[PDB]
Design a protein around this ligand. Structure first.
Ligand SMILES: CCOC(=O)CCc1ccc(S(N)(=O)=O)cc1
Ligand SMILES: [Zn+2]
Length: 258
């Protein structure tokens, strides 16, 4: 690809190939709690995922993705600021070189070790992810900040699957898994209109950021960074980091459900 996270093809240079990178609805962002606007119009978040929709895990070079079958509404997200039902299709993570950083969103300037993203597309208005991907109200992503600490047992199945997709392009069946089990006990959240955090960077994401974080150990994070960005046979190139710096809010208002 013509983009990555290196010095030459990293976030700082993405605007040269993708001008929208300097847009008005870019993500992630720093959430300043003193400036958040509590909205009583926000309903609780509701997630109902069917473990049978889990499909495959893929090493995409810069990260790894766990995709789900999205032919129907067996797995959906509702409530919050949505009136329409959003269909789950994937979840993945972002992390940094060291524990000091790794998350994409930040709260009051505080950076966490990694971040979990659970993505969905508007199947109420659109017919496919491809169509919805570029629509202002096309995507919905739940972001969960991961604070380094005790090992998180709920990450086990995912972590155990990485040894099968070590190098770029590798992919394997990943089934019978319900990602709602990775979410924090409380679903209080913040929401704002944003975008994909990496190319194509479409400003089509309604973000749902959980107030409560989930844990992850230094060793578990080591496993993410142990993934390789090269194709099998070439010299190993560890996947050290894949988080984008926070972007300018530019007038946007972050709403709180609590
Ligand atoms: C199976 C096809 O998968 C996709 O097209 C995923 C697109 C995609 C969804 C969400 C995000 S993020 N970082 O903004 O949460 C990035 C890229
Ligand atoms: Zn992401």
């Amino acid at each position: 690809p013509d983009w990555g996270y290196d010095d030459k093809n990293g976030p700082e240079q993405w605007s040269k190939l993708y001008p929208i990178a300097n847009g008005n609805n870019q993500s992630p962002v720093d959430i300043k709690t003193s400036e958040t606007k509590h909205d009583t119009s926000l309903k609780p978040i509701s997630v109902s995922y069917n473990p049978a929709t889990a499909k495959e895990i893929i090493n995409v070079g810069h990260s790894f993705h766990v995709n789900f079958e999205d032919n129907d509404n067996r797995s959906v997200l509702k409530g919050g600021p949505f009136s329409d039902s959003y269909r789950l299709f994937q979840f993945h993570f972002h992390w940094g070189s060291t524990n000091e950083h790794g998350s994409e969103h930040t709260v009051d300037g505080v950076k966490y070790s990694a971040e979990l993203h659970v993505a969905h597309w508007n199947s109420a208005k659109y017919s496919s992810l491809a169509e919805a991907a570029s629509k202002a109200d096309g995507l919905a992503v739940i972001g969960v900040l991961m604070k380094v600490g005790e090992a998180n047992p709920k990450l086990q199945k995912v972590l155990d699957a990485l040894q099968a997709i070590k190098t770029k392009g590798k992919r394997a069946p990943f089934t019978n898994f319900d990602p709602s089990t990775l979410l924090p006990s409380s679903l209080d959240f913040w929401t704002y209109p944003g975008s994909l955090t990496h190319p194509p960077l479409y400003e089509s994401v309604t973000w749902i950021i959980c107030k409560e974080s989930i844990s992850v150990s230094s060793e578990q994070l080591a496993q993410f960074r142990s993934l390789l960005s090269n194709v099998e046979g070439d010299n190993a190139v560890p996947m050290q980091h894949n988080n984008r710096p926070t972007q300018p809010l530019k007038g946007r208002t972050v709403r709180a459900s609590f």
